[PDB]
Design a protein around this ligand. Sequence first.
Ligand SMILES: Nc1ncnc2c1ncn2[C@@H]1O[C@H](COP(=O)(O)O)[C@@H](O)[C@H]1O
Ligand SMILES: N=C(N)NCCC[C@@H](C(=O)O)N1CCC1=O
Ligand SMILES: [Mg+2]
Ligand SMILES: [Mg+2]
Length: 491
Amino acid sequence: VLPAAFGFLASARGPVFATRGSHTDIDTPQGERSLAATLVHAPSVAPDRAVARSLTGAPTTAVLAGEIYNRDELLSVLPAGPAPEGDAELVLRLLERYDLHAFRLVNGRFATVVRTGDRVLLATDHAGSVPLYTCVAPGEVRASTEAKALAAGFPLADARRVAGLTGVYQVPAGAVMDIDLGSGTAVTHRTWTPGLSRRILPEGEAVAAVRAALEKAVAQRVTPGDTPLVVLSGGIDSSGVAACAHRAAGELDTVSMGTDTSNEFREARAVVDHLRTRHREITIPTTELLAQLPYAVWASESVDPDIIEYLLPLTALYRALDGPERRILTGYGADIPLGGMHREDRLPALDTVLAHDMATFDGLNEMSPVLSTLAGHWTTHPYWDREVLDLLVSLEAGLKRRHGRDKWVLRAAMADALPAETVNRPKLGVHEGSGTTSSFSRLLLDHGVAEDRVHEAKRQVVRELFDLTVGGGRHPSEVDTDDVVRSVADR
Ligand SMILES: Nc1ncnc2c1ncn2[C@@H]1O[C@H](COP(=O)(O)O)[C@@H](O)[C@H]1O
Ligand SMILES: N=C(N)NCCC[C@@H](C(=O)O)N1CCC1=O
Ligand SMILES: [Mg+2]
Ligand SMILES: [Mg+2]
């Protein structure tokens, strides 16, 4: 049900993560010139499948956090028949055949570090959905799924430095960093890049392809026998995912979050009734929502005020979940390739914003698994599935904004599976349906923070939280959001 590991801290030559779970140190056969690592994973899963060893080429050790979705495909290009036992061994098999190019073939939600001889490889999935950070110095390489574990040396080109940190870099999305341990030299190869050209397709085929892709992406994300949990908002995106997940599992559990300001329970109810899902509504006080601020920056390790604002309600929801650890699917990210913020018929502006968004998502960590695993829950997002993403991004603007409706192709793709009311439902940003942006603004406004200046205040606040939780090793619970807002408002 859950991946073999959520993250890790490794070194090639006392880990503390936001992620909740068991810790397991891997054995160090060649004790020495070996790959040491601490894996963080669910208490209910065996780390084994997240670790693979080999002698092909050299002594080799692979560690992988997360999971791969196009397994059948990758397996079809391998020689022998005895299939690898897990995703880490699968990667290993692929590396022995394509070398670092193996990552150009992977469609997944993972982060991995591999040591073969004195060579070290650091790879992320196409979207860098599972953040990966590193510190490289001649003779020593440290990699971790959380920068906070690395804050406790040389500069690396074609990698960005982490805010308020030194010698700590984030491996870019869709990339593989090839590091020679001896010289400490690092070379980065991109293994995926957003398509820039657009595809033309008749309505019927376009709508069918989108439906088929999403169904497949969702199917790849639901575990056989296990009923998944979908964070439902009543919007077309999460609703589209719910319909697909329900079909792949034959049943479905849903959940919706709301505040005392706002909610989308009504819109969500329409869908829970259409598919007859096991639904649950959660209402967290606005004051409780804002108190989540330090937890969001700590888990996401992001400094973008706008993203942190989008993550607040999600973070609160994951932490407020009751019951056993769940496999959660979301409809997050659908608006990006579809320009879900575009509100007119003039297509030009839609593509401009789309191209810009697709070129600047890396580093935001908005889809990081830590957002949910901080409470022991694993999340995956089918709309940013490589295949679904490639397709949605490639469609010509006229298929996204058509018939006076935004994200048209997606709405039409779920038409025969959801109520008409849900299909035509205008877009709403979870920030609007629960009043997160307004609440955060009101908080600053109630502290004296003037208007043409709340945004910058939100920046200073978020950045201050980061320096404390990520750079200073301070746990969110030990941080009082009000005190930080106070300090920032004084300016
Ligand atoms: N009020 C909510 N309760 C539960 N899940 C939500 C809620 N609002 C949004 N989500 C989830 O998070 C994603 C946010 O995307 P968006 O609505 O485009 O901002 C949706 O695709 C849902 O899966
Ligand atoms: N430029 C970006 N990377 N924007 C991300 C906004 C997320 C968007 C989504 O679901 O794609 N989203 C959150 C509410 C909403 O809309
Ligand atoms: Mg959406
Ligand atoms: Mg919404």
